[PDB]
Structures are given as structure tokens and as C-alpha cells.
Amino acid sequence: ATADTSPERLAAIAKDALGALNDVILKHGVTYPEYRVFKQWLIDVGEGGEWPLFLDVFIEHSVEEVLARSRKGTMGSIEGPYYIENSPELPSKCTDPMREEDEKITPLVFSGQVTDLDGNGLAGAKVELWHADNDGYYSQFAPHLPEWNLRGTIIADEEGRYEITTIQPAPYQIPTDGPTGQFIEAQNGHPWRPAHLHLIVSAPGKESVTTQLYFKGGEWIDSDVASATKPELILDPKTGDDGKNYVTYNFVLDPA
Amino acid sequence: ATADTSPERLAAIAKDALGALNDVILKHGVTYPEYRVFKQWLIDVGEGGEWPLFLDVFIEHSVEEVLARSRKGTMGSIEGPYYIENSPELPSKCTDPMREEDEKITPLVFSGQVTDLDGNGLAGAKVELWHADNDGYYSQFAPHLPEWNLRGTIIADEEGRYEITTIQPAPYQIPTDGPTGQFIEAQNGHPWRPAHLHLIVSAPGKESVTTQLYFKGGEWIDSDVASATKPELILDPKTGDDGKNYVTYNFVLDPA
Ligand SMILES: [Fe+3]
Ligand SMILES: [Fe+3]
């Protein structure tokens, strides 16, 4: 990973970041014993491989909040740590790869169109979708799952349209047996995200959007540990006589 | 390491700490590419064993600043990462263990008395001293050095007095081939501390003090990378006809 950043830019960032953390220590009167526990917890986070996990929960939302300022199209949200590139391409009407156990779950039929800022349908558009199974696992981050379970890249039709069938996502618990869990448990926090879809939607000439979609009424919608849910990203699916949940949502991309 | 800290206390600390870091991201418009470099640098700090190093430089001074509020005796300073307990006991008049190469250095003769807040000399008092060699190495953090090089615990006399001979400390460069060095180099910073002695001074019934002493006129006195030097802790040694540097400094301890 490389950035553009000038020494002068880094210096300024570092100075208020360090200055703010130091202000918090003074404000709360952080003690030597607390400093020692903090130092061991940092070490533990690294040893536990939880930097991506911790940062995406507690920091990423601010970085997307920045990116949001320059965007006029559909609201973005955090990526989180479980995106994988090159998920297998699928037709504009399709179902995600899934296991026999996933076929037990109420299906979700997600339809819509990828457009520009004026609502024109975009040719060449792609919808990359990934999400957790009903057990709260992501493929490629769970040894028992086939590697593309609930992952694909949907090739939208000539008008930018898609119809994607998957399983209805369920609330997502952040892994709690590590340092991050310890940190949340230790302040009587709630290690939970509302049920969600992750998406990256892209089109030639357009800026891709990384976002997430949630479900009206869902548990943890008003208390996402990642602070990443937005009102604009809440779906209200309707259940059909086939027992499936149907919902349409359009993507609106900014120019590149 | 354990603290007392209540969940409610942790929650409040975490909230303004996270809230402040998030404020800095928004203030500077931290970009996705910068976020990725930050995430890899955190990982690098852990992999490099540099948590103690980084925190003691950039964070500890604030934690001592808190502790300072409740103290009336001699100014404290940061401990830094190189204190070792149980350094070999020495008489009230003594010289620190050192190598033949250290005997090449101009000697420093450090005298004084350990007292209470009213200036009464304290019996039972101890002065634990450690500091870098002229090459900028600390024993036990440099494979070539004998383990107590420039380390001891001085047993002060019945009146709390000591006379300790050592070598004149020289400016201290923080280790720069790791993530911390990278971080400092990347903002055109200065990876240097002024020459210093580290001390922990203790007496029965009294609160120990962890502090440091520096040298009038010394390089980096006005630009310590650790932000840890205090005007009150600056020695002005006088050179005798024997070529040695003499200085007296008294310790004034708070009640326990
Ligand atoms: Fe997720
Ligand atoms: Fe030092």
C-alpha cells in the first residue's frame, strides 16, 4: 500500500492525532497501570492478527465519511476486512454460489439498475457482492466454507440491470475471542453489526462505489458497532407468495 | 499488567479517543490510500517489536503529565522502555559498572541527597540509575554489552546522601531501521533525545519517583523527540581540574 502523502502532510496529521490522544489521557487522568494494560493490548492486537478487524470496525467509517464528501451518487459504506477480488463472474440474472445448508435459508431476490447521476442506465456495469452466511461466516475467512460461498461479480445487462438471488443475511457478530472482543466486552459494549450485504459497483468512466445494504427493522440497525449504517442504505424487502424476499435498489455512480 | 478500570471508565476513554482520531481523519481528509498505509504500519510496529519504543516516545509523556498533577516533590519524567529491576546494589559512594571502553569517556560525578518535602534527609533511600553508553546502547538491549553496564541501585547513606560516578551521557538516537524510524523519517522529524540519565528514587514511606536528568546547553534539549525534558531536570555540571564533570542534584519525595 502506498499513498501520495508529503512529509509536511504526515507531520500535521501525526501532530493532531498524537496531540488528541494526549489530550484524552489528560482529560481522563489515564494512570500508569492503565498505560501498561493499553501497551499490552496493542501488542496483543498485532499478535492476534486483528489490525484489519479492529480498524475497520472503529476507524474505517471516518475514512468513508471523508470520501463521501466528494460524492453525489449512492451512499458508500465501509469495505470491512473480507472483500476478495476476482470473485467468479455471473450473468445479470443469477444466483450466488451457495451450499446445500444455505438453500435452507429464506431467499433474497435483489433487483435494480446501475445508473449515472441523471438516472441513465449504464452499460459495462458490474456488481460485486459478498456477505456472511446464516452462521456469521465469510468464505475465505472460515476453513469449512467453499471459497466463493456467497460471493460473485454480477455482470449487469446492456441497460445496467441485475437480478441477484442469495440468502437473507442475518445479524453479524464480530469475532470475540481476540483482543478486539476483549476490548468490547471490557466496556459492556455490543459486538454486533446489523445484517448486511457488501457491494462494490463499478462502470466504465465511473468512480466505483463500495457500500452495504441493510434491512428495515433489523436487529442492531440503530446500534452498529462499526458505526457504518446509513438511513439511505436500508432496504425494505417484500415477501412474495413463494416465501422469498424481494427488493429493488438502484446504484447511481459518480463520474471518474 | 492489570488496572482497576471500570467498563464505564473504559467506555468513556475509548469514546473520546476514537472520536478524536475520527475528528483528525475528517479534519485532514485522510484518504483510502493513506488509511491502507496506516493499517500496514500498525501491523509493522507489532511485527517489529516496537510498541514499547513507539509508545514511550510519543505517548508516555502525557501519562507522566497526569501523574505530575498529584506530586509536589521532584519533577518526574518518562521511564522509557529500558528500565530493569534488581540492578546490583552499590554503596552510597560508588561508581557504576562499566567497560574499559567506557573508562575512555569524561567521567560524571553525581552527588546529592534524597529528602522529604521539607528537606529532611531520608534514611533507607535508594537511587536506581541507568543510562546509555557513548555509542547510544543500553545494556540488556544490546547483545555486546555486559548486562549491568551503566546500571545500579545506589544505597544512599543514613542522611540520604549519594556520590555516584559514571560516564557523561551523550545524545541518544532512537532506533531508526524499524517502523518508528520510518514514521519519523517520513515527516522529516528528528529521531533524537538529549543526553540523559534515567533514575528511580525511592524511600520507605515515600512515593518513588521515576525521572531523568539532562545537561545545560546539550544538543536536542529544546527538541526532544519524546517531549520528556523539563527545565527543572537540567543539570549544569562544573568541570574540575581532574577533567571530571561534577554536579549535585537533590531528590525530594512525596509521601506514599
Ligand atoms: Fe460484513
Ligand atoms: Fe533513555
Swiss-Prot record, chains A, B:
This is Catechol 1,2-dioxygenase. PROSITE patterns: INTRADIOL_DIOXYGENAS (PS00083). Its cofactor is Fe(3+). One of its GO terms (biological process) is catabolic process. InterPro entries: 1_2-CTD_multi_dom (IPR043029), Catechol_dOase_N (IPR007535), Cchol_dOase_actb (IPR012800), Chlorcchol_dOase (IPR012817), Intradiol_dOase_C (IPR000627), Intradiol_dOase_core (IPR015889), Intradiol_RC_Dioxygenase (IPR050770). Keywords: Aromatic hydrocarbons catabolism, Dioxygenase, Iron, Metal-binding, Oxidoreductase. Fe cation binds at residues 138, 172, 196, 198. Its EC number is 1.13.11.1. Binds 1 Fe(3+) ion per subunit. It catalyses: catechol + O2 = cis,cis-muconate + 2 H(+). GO terms for molecular function: catechol 1,2-dioxygenase activity; ferric iron binding. Belongs to the intradiol ring-cleavage dioxygenase family. It comes from the Bacteria.
